[PDB]
Amino acid sequence: GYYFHTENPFKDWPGAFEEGLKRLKEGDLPVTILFMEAAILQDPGDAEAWQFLGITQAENENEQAAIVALQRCLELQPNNLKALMALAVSYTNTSHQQDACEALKNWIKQNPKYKYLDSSVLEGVKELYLEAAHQNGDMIDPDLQTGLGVLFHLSGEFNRAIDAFNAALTVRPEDYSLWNRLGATLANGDRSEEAVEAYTRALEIQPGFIRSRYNLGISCINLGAYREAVSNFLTALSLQRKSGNIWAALRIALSLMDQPELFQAANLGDLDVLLRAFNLD
Amino acid sequence: RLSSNL
Incomplete structure (x- = not known):
């Protein structure tokens, strides 16, 4: 169950979701979360609110919530990719392989591009990502590159993972989240x-x-x-x-x-x- | 001894 900020000042704020997006873009996470939560209130069943909430929460260095809100979003909109990705990274951070891999497996599952296409379960999902990656010859998939760098981390190959991330970063030179996944991966890789x-x-x-x-x-x-x-x-x-x-x-x-x-x-x-x-x- | 978050 999710712990909501009680007495949310923005509970009646009309544009709450949209506004949260603005704040987020402008770099205020706490207020972003307040607006997101308010959103969910105004529309409990609105999944995007839950997605961005979870994610933002993760960026808030509160993972525990990030997971609840994410699994919430996926409960509502099981096919939400940004949420499958994020939730995978988070299951990673908290050291759950079964679950991270679950969300990666399903990520591929709900992924239109990839629809068609101790521990070897993890290994199976890793190969799984690697193939489709290969099937994209020229233009890469930062999100795919992501899940892959993740799989590498989770698997233990840090150079591979780092490559994956610089790879993604090449497409999105500005994704702050990805620069973090990089730093995190190097430091984690003792560099x-x-x-x-x-x-x-x-x-x-x-x-x-x-x-x-x-x-x-x-x-x-x-x-x-x-x-x-x-x-x-x-x-x-x-x-x-x-x-x-x-x-x-x-x-x-x-x-x-x-x-x-x-x-x-x-x-x-x-x-x-x-x-x-x-x-x- | 620590762990970084992604």
């Missing part, structure tokens, strides 16, 4: 500086991007850059309140700067204490 450039790109596109601030932080840790890791964690929470996992990371980086007063503030999740810090924000 951290690379990952950082990717994240920086994403955030240069959608500066409201929670998941990229987070991922970025993780990378900075991996680099031993701490003051910066923290800065990103804070900036994140500041934007998110406008997830505990972010808290967790922060607590860690902090522990590495060995800054005890601050670390205590963090252990308590006392946020404004941390704005400064040193004249931060």
